[PDB]
């Protein structure tokens, strides 16, 4: 019945204030994909440019939640753009032995870190995995984690070392599917990273409508967002 | 001058469980990490756990994974071991160790005598 | 586990004597990180163990100028340049490259009379 072009009316006031919230770059993206649905013609073409809408907003909830910068994906740092700048002198080694599987060299994660396309700086990775560590232990939130080690090697307090931080999150119905697809995609290249000497850490994580509103990965008020304007818009869209 | 006093040995019997503590002394205990080492009468040193400044990495020798915690109380620069289902084989002088900058042991404590037996 | 092979399993030395002692490790005790975690101690008869080196070749504050240490790798050397009878006791070799720590087996040092 409601065309669509009219659900995008009435949620205008939902849209606006996650429009408001969202970081600058974030917010553009989701204002253009916001347009893109309410001139689609097909019901194919408005839910996919809705589907972007999910994933690039709780992004950018995610960002403002960890205090991280939101990057678009257009200007993501690769795994290979990360060895380079910050091990250099390991990036020769580092092609050499990604030489059978070169899809690892463009990786890229929503989160691309080291500890203080550019890769951003954070003054704690130990301090990120023990935040995620202690929600999944606290409200069972599934996560997973791995660190790279070389052979059976002991951290040591006498030198600091560069290290990686790799994040992937996400906004998807099969939680524990996410993360599982994630951590089995990145195995690969922790295994990499341990015969290399290179220090990183991987971890995942996921949301979706069905976590109680205190639970997510996002702040509570970000949640309200997101379920006020695009998951009420995925409703409309269905019925209509 | 760094020190480090061991406490809490004595006679446990076979199963049972025992804590020792570590008092440190004359440097910034928070800033380093913290170690077990364990002597076995007229055989050759053993180690037992490491503990991180911030409790984050904790390591242990595989004969004790499962039966033993090592924890820190920072505030009263104070090192934990908690021992339990000891065996006959646990009997040893447990020392205190830390390296006050490294994984080394640099300083030591005199001992504490752990006797498990019936 | 890394196994540290020390050699000779005793070593008789006259006072004023060089004293030689090997290490043996089973792999490589290079970290990533650049270091070598390789560290010599004595144990006195009936005191607790004392650090004489860290890190291959450091010698540890307040350490006689005697004692030295020397290697890379797997292959490793701890030197008495001129024995005096207070070295009397168990030198032991450790490595904390590699979790778990471990020991030598230890080497007696015996004052030839």
């Known amino acids: 019945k409601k065309p669509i072009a009219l659900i995008c009316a009435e949620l205008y006031k939902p849209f606006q204030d996650l429009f408001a919230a969202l970081p600058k770059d974030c917010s553009e993206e989701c204002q253009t994909l916001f347009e893109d649905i309410r001139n689609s013609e097909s019901h194919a073409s408005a839910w996919s440019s809705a589907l972007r809408i999910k994933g690039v907003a709780y992004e950018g909830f995610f960002s403002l939640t960890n205090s991280w910068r939101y990057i678009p994906e257009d200007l993501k740092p690769t795994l290979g753009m990360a060895i380079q700048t910050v091990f250099p002198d390991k990036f020769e080694k580092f092609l050499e032995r990604t030489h059978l599987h070169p899809e690892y060299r463009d990786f890229t994660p929503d989160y691309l870190m080291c500890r203080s396309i550019a890769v951003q700086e954070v003054s704690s990775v130990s301090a990120v995995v023990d935040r995620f560590k202690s929600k999944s232990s606290e409200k069972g939130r599934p996560i997973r984690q791995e660190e790279s080690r070389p052979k059976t090697e002991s951290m040591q307090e006498d030198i600091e070392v560069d290290e990686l931080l790799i994040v992937e999150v996400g906004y998807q119905t099969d939680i524990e599917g996410k993360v599982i697809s994630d951590i089995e995609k990145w195995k690969g290249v922790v295994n990499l990273m341990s015969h290399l000497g290179i220090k990183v850490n991987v971890l995942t994580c996921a949301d979706n409508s069905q976590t109680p509103r205190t639970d997510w990965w996002i702040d509570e008020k970000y949640v309200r967002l997101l379920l006020n304007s695009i998951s009420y818009l995925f409703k409309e869209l269905l019925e209509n | 001058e760094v020190k480090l006093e061991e406490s809490g040995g004595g006679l446990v019997r076979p199963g049972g469980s025992r804590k020792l503590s570590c008092a440190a002394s004359?440097?910034?205990?928070?800033?380093?990490?913290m170690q077990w080492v364990r002597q076995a009468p007229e055989k050759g040193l053993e180690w037992v756990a490491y503990?991180?400044?911030?409790?984050?990495?904790?390591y242990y020798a595989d004969t004790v994974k499962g039966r033993f915690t090592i924890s820190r109380d920072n505030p009263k620069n104070t090192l934990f071991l908690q021992m339990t289902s000891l065996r006959s084989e646990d009997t040893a002088m447990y020392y205190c160790?830390?390296?006050?900058?490294?994984?080394?042991?640099?300083?030591w404590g005199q001992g504490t005598l752990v006797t498990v037996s019936a | 586990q890394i196994v540290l092979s020390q050699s000779p399993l005793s070593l008789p030395v006259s006072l004023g004597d060089q004293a030689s002692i090997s290490c043996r490790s089973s792999?490589?005790?290079?970290?990533?990180?650049?270091?070598?975690?390789l560290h010599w101690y004595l144990q006195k008869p009936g005191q607790s163990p004392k650090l004489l080196i860290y890190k291959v070749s450091n010698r540890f504050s307040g350490v006689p100028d005697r004692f030295s240490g020397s290697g890379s790798g797997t292959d490793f050397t701890l030197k008495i340049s001129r024995v005096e009878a207070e070295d009397l006791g168990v030198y032991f070799c450790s490595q904390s490259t590699h979790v778990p720590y471990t020991f030598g087996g230890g080497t007696k040092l015996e004052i030839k009379r």
């Open positions: 503990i991180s400044s911030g409790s984050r990495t904790i």
């Open positions: 792999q490589s005790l290079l970290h990533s990180n650049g270091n070598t975690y």
């Open positions: 004359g440097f910034t205990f928070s800033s380093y990490g």
């Open positions: 160790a830390t390296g006050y900058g490294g994984t080394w042991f640099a300083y």
